[PDB]
């Protein structure tokens, strides 16, 4: 009776066993069909040239339930090599996940995979737990969506959650944009993968945007070279920080939305006055798109400008931020005190799928 932990993201699945310190499998959240009859995860990616890819999770939400079932089946049987009917399964969901979506996940786990028990946790909350906290505000930026999730004593506060429809995939696309201004042409799906590697390796958040652009314009001290797979070597400059600057200025890609520093402040300002200090002192970064060097310092600067002068602002950026959601789930699911909170098959059978709201919050 060992529990499984599955963290389903728009871009990557992280799956493993509760009590482990790392997920056993990390693979793209993709289903490919020929351009057998379908391929999932790491097959479908290494075999990409002969496949058309579909992403069942978009913008943090499951949009294709048939292909999401394939991802789950592939997670259980191919990657983890377990029979789901023998294991309690902890799943994760985005903040403000629609009611009908959570019920559909629950129904599938119980009626299709016949799990003995399951639980649905909000990803941001698991990241807060992984950092040793039960109170704080989480900035979760992944591949498809970015959220500010204030959390007080294990309860995410849905009225104060902020959502920015901008994350790693958009930043990759934006870096493809602006690299063309330097004269480089990255168009194909394989070239997108290269630009994503450029972003993950060379990009950073400037502490002050205008100063950094002036530095980049008057010298080459911020330029960095990158070897393409074919051996050719390109040089990138102010794109290093112009790409993630979009998080703070979404209008760079034409979004009429406030940047992540302002949404953090507004989310705090929608919480009870009583708890705001604890939120300001516990700003936890999570997700792959918060990995940029310098993002913590910039958030500290920008929130200090918005918050009252006496407030203490701390930004926590743990080193395993790509995996904090999974680690938090591994911790939670393996706690002795957690076990009464699994939804059991009997409770599901007696209440219907609406049991997930009663028990997961």
């Amino acid at each position: 009776t060992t529990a499984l932990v599955c963290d389903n993201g728009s871009g990557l699945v992280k799956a493993g066993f509760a009590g482990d310190d790392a997920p056993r499998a990390v693979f793209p959240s993709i289903v490919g069909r020929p351009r057998k009859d379908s391929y999932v995860g790491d097959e479908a990616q290494s075999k990409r040239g002969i496949l058309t890819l579909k992403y069942p999770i978009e913008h943090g939400i499951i949009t294709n339930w048939d292909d999401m079932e394939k991802i789950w089946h592939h997670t259980f049987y191919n990657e983890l090599r377990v029979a789901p009917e023998e294991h309690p399964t902890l799943l994760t969901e985005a903040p403000l996940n629609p009611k009908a979506n959570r019920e559909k996940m629950t129904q599938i786990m119980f009626e299709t995979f016949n799990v003995p028990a399951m639980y649905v946790a909000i990803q941001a909350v698991l990241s807060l737990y992984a950092s040793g906290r039960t109170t704080g505000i989480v900035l979760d930026s992944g591949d498809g969506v970015t959220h500010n999730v204030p959390i007080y004593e294990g309860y995410a506060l849905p009225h104060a959650i902020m959502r920015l429809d901008l994350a790693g995939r958009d930043l990759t696309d934006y870096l493809m944009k602006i690299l063309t201004e330097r004269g480089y042409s990255f168009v194909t799906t394989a070239e997108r993968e290269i630009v994503r590697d450029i972003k993950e390796k060379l990009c950073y958040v400037a502490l002050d945007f205008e100063n950094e652009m002036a530095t980049a314009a008057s010298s080459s001290s911020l330029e960095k070279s990158y070897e393409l797979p074919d051996g050719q070597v390109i040089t990138i400059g102010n794109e290093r920080f112009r790409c993630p600057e979009t998080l703070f200025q979404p209008s760079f890609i034409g979004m009429e939305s406030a940047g992540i520093h302002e949404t953090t402040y507004n989310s705090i300002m929608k919480c009870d006055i009583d708890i705001r200090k604890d939120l300001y002192a516990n700003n936890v970064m999570s997700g792959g798109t918060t990995m940029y060097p310098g993002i913590a310092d910039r958030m500290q600067k920008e929130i200090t400008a918005l918050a009252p002068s006496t407030m203490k602002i701390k930004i926590i950026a743990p080193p395993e931020r790509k995996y904090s959601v999974w680690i938090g789930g591994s911790i939670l699911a393996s706690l002795s005190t957690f076990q009464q909170m699994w939804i059991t098959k009997q409770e599901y059978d007696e209440a219907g799928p609406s049991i997930v709201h009663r028990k997961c919050f």
Binding site: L335, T337, M341
Partner: peptide, 22 residues
């Protein structure tokens, strides 16, 4: 309260060492 015992466990259980290396 059952929630608080879980929250207390999350903060001070020591779970993060207790995770097996894999």
């Amino acid at each position: 309260s059952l929630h608080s015992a879980l929250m207390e466990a999350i903060r001070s259980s020591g779970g993060r060492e207790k995770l097996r290396k894999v």
